[model samples]
Target: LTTIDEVPGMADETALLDWLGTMREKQPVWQDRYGVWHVFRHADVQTVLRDTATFSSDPTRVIEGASPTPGMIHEIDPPEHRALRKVVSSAFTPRTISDLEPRIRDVTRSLLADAGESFDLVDVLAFPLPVTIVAELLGLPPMDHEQFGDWSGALVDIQMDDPTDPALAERIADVLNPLTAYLKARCAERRADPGDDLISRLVLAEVDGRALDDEEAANFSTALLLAGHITTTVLLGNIVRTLDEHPAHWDAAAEDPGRIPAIVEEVLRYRPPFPQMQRTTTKATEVAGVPIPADVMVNTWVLSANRDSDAHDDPDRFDPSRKSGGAAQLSFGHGVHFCLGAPLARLENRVALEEIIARFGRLTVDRDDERLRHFEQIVLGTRHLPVLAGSSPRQSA
Candidate 1:
């Protein structure tokens, strides 16, 4: 329990909560044997995430081996990053995302109809929904779903560290190089013949009176194509997982659809899909009175922070009605690098939960299914969760 990595059920949501509760109190800041620092506590996690100057988002700043994919909009800091993000933000504006409500619901219903009564929710609704929307948005071929899923799976599976030692260059290139080329071709097509898709928007988006160069547009769009879907996919799965664990809330959700928004917020707080984030130290600094030197990797356990008692009255309890936790939750992050897809993620989560809750009587996780498991990768989500509704359709309820 001393080291975050070694904690029993580190991948299990409940066990990790109890262990993190004590750990945050015991040591708000501690270095593991690997010398990487982990920051717990709500306020402290926010501090590290906000102070991007001291804790560099660019992995290349590390004296150790940097990420093979540098200059990614994910890695880019402010100034240049500011304009590049704005280019994409034009497409994700509130009005733009809200306009998709009817389409999202239609997609949700289609997915439920295809899934029928008994099936793996992750395979049926969670994984396919977000990726489908992303493909539609980017105007990719439906045939590209399986291929894109493979690329996304490969991308999220690896944890960042000094990448050179592990020889990730081969694997990283195998996926990313092709991904970059695929996007490049997509961008070229848009330039020659623009469509109403997001990729076309990226091609047409201008920054500071200048259109994005091919590389800038392609790299940022690559992140959008991957991060845009993958993050929301986990959000959908997490909401299902939370409701299954707490069935009493399911009936409430169906009765009062307004509660769906609040419940989704609580899910993000209770079990964040992407629980943790990393930043490299640009210079020697202190977090919660613990001195961390330059060139060190700092892991912020925002999941631990979400449950920190300092920030919430009943941090351990899942109170969907609680209003204070939404802005306080660091899951979408803060400051300059705040998730660009936050608005879209929130909208998609609300719609998917609404449809699922209304259409089904009850969702019970088939925990004993052989394929039922957590993704042991850097992300926090299910590999494939089997949800059995049996014949308990809402009509019977």
Candidate 2:
């Protein structure tokens, strides 16, 4: 407990990442204020994620509760997890993501047309672009993008810091209740008349020769909406913020648009959106020589793992040309619980970055306004990032 209390640098993003790097170097596994064991090294985090037999996904046992909807696939183990994952895997394959490229480019262009020269990138492009694309993918009506954004913030806000509070449960319910109701209604509509969208795909999807029921379909749709939009939004913002900080990368991307994908990969490693993922131990385990008791909470410090010195050269700096081949980190996680939306996120970020270069020519952060504020949760992303976008031809890196 004293170790948890004395864990340095919980004040801001830079300080926290620095603290995590220090911990990974000195104590790769340590406990936090919540009495949760945190594994910081890349190998240890990979170990925790890969060995799901010794770690359960539903740390709080939400699956056993009286919920109207089924839990997300990430919160469930194999067999069931495999079945649920299969139901949606087709929608996010590399080919499917490739097909979405033009549409993603269109969305990016439209957003930039309205973004102007000086605006909050998050408000105009990062959030709405992904939300619009996700809505289209799900066949949902043109709902308020900002409302869903707020709901996502609420969802993330309540879960961070102290999630065990009863009020936090109430706050989460407040966001999920209406969202679930809406998705359920959409599920009914899709069932009565199927379309060529993900919701309809789920409606017709069969697990073990049995079609997904209404609740299962709706909950799955809800997960897609959240996963398909929020994480990508955060990723886009992080990419923009990182490139703005490292103008050389931006210039490189603008000069040779082919480098955009590499830049995106570097951003994912340098500043992953979901910084931590929680798992409950199924039995007693040891990580990096530290013993973790059975049924205890474990926080995998993904951001820390991404920067582990053992995993990459000069782990502290942002360099896409480090010859890692873009598979440098555990950003999409490892094993069966790997991010289902990974392809989609990559496509969205790549398209957005390309369009940004095409339109901006040169991009720089508006530090005078200091509009860069990050999500106050464990997720590492910019809530708002103001930047100066100059419209000109491509410049050399």
CA lDDT, every model vs. true structure: 0.75, 0.77
Candidate 1 to truth, TM: 0.91
Question: Where does model 2 exceed 4 Å of error?
Answer: 1-11, 62-71, 91-93, 145-148, 164-167, 325-329, 392-397
Instruction: Indicate the worst ten consecutive residues by lDDT in candidate 1.
Output: 160-169
Across 76-182, the per-residue lDDT of candidate 2 in tens digits comes to 78767777777667444567556778899998998787766788877888888888888888888877549437878777766546543446556666887788789
Q: Write the per-residue lDDT of candidate 1 for residues 24-70, one digit (tens) a residue.
A: 98878888767788898889999999987898777666535554353
- Taking all chains together, each candidate's TM-score versus the true structure is 0.91, 0.91
Clashing pairs for model 2 are: none
Q: Which stretches of candidate 1 lie over 4 Å from their true place?
A: 1-9, 63-71, 159-166, 390-397
